[PDB]
Amino acid sequence: VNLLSIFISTWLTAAGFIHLVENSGDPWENFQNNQALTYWECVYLLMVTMSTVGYGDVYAKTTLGRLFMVFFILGGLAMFASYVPEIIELIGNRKKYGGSYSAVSGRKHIVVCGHIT
Amino acid sequence: TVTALKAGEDKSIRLGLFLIISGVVSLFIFGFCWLSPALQDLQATEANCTVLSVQQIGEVFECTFTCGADCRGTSQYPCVQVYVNNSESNSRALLHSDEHQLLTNPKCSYIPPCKRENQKNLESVMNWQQYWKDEIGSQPFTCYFNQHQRPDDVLLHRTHDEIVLLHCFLWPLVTFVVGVLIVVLTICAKSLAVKAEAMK
Amino acid sequence: TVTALKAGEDKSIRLGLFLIISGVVSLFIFGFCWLSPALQDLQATEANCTVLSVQQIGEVFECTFTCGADCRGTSQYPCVQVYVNNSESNSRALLHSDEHQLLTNPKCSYIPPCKRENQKNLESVMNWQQYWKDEIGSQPFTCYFNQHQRPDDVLLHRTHDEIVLLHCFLWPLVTFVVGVLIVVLTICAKSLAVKAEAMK
Amino acid sequence: SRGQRMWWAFLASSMVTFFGGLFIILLWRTLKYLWTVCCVGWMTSVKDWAGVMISAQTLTGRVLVVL
Ligand SMILES: CC(C)CCC[C@@H](C)[C@H]1CC[C@H]2[C@@H]3CC=C4C[C@@H](O)CC[C@]4(C)[C@H]3CC[C@]12C
């Protein structure tokens, strides 16, 4: 729950900052270089960046946005490469040989234990 | 000693230093971002200017209207061109009004506010042209020129407003000053608290 | 005790909870996906409407026909435009029939079913035009309008059918209800089996 | 016969088979036990033969899993 909360929170927060910065362009450029990205398009962009897939179908075009993406590449790659293996390791370790024996009428059984090899 | 307040005060020093660093770093970032725009605008001369000829080239360019929410609307408008006198070249140069116009279509002197009707962009260019068509020999404009790079283009307006330039360099400096005040007040609290503790 | 059936029953709880979660999550996913479409359609007003002028602009746009299996077939058709009265604006606005038409070419009031022959798309637009050309002063249409965003465009049809909208929100709710019934029947079986085992 | 779609019938046949069966199983667990509160065997030989087919224990069973 700690790893999931920090991963999801960081991803959604960082997607919101790049959303704001790409939709309101560089001040020096008189805000003319903005890009109309939705919030979900920014969430998808950060996942494609964190995983290092980097399709370049969508990418940050403003200077403030490219700036932020350099710091997100330095922090978010290490976060994804550390957290995703560990969240997958904490899930799905389902014990295959739990459960119990069901006896059937007219058929006996024996229990074998000790040095099972 | 050590004291209970040390953790909050040392974190306050880390914040004040991060704001000093972020102030200086954002000052350099805005410095390089504004360098080419600020030179390209402030190198332009300011001049007294007078209209000397006007004409349509007998050919049309296309603008794009928007309805709001996902429209293209590509539509023709008349290309009117206007030539103007200036104090540096004293010779024929093409007027483009705002910088954007020049960047989007430098063969015409104007672009109308693009609309769903060809007739409205036609009459808009006629309604604009009949002004500069009569300003022949009128009292001078004040206008902008760039002999080093644009010897045959002339502008009525600046490329940016100085307000957005000023704000981009004000808030880095305020960020740096706030960071310095946080460092000073925190060090003052640490170094004065031990004097009060000895004097108690 | 423990019992042999515990493994299947606890797996049945994991399934019922996964269906409850998937029901709620898909309800939010369809919620955000339908939010902009449902507002953009349901904000449009419904009005009584009458034709007031019709004309061809003397210029042609291109459609694309398909043969089936990999054809482009780019072919010209006449651009006819139609203006219509409505109860909110009471003024000249362009009829576009369906929403798709407006999105693909808002300068014309119609797009024909595109075909390999220019003559068939010509006569199709003539055969369409001769209807709206005579409907001048006829009994009103019922038609759709959007004063907040499209003050000069008018539609004969909705942007989506309510059936596909309804199905997108029905099956999430059914998924949630099925998940709840699986959880309830499994807990009922676990908690009743121990009463039967004690009573035997 | 174009202009009609039937995809929902294919999907419903799977959804109704899986969940319909699952509820029959559960409802059977809630009715068998409830009746007792309200109010070697032949089956095992069939289950033994089926288990011996499902594994490759016999010639028949090893032909089945290769298929
Ligand atoms: C007995 C097993 C397969 C359980 C599966 C139930 C399935 C087969 C049921 C549930 C819904 C049913 C379908 C729904 C209605 C129609 C439309 C009708 O014009 C053809 C039959 C068809 C397509 C039905 C066939 C049988 C059906 C698919």
Ligand SMILES: CC(C)CCC[C@@H](C)[C@H]1CC[C@H]2[C@@H]3CC=C4C[C@@H](O)CC[C@]4(C)[C@H]3CC[C@]12C
């Ligand atoms: C065919 C689909 C629809 C349902 C399958 C049959 C279901 C509903 C019925 C028929 C036979 C029944 C099974 C008969 C044998 C056993 C062995 C017991 O140790 C576990 C439950 C169990 C007792 C019963 C569960 C319910 C059951 C599986």
Ligand SMILES: [K+]
């Ligand atoms: K890659």
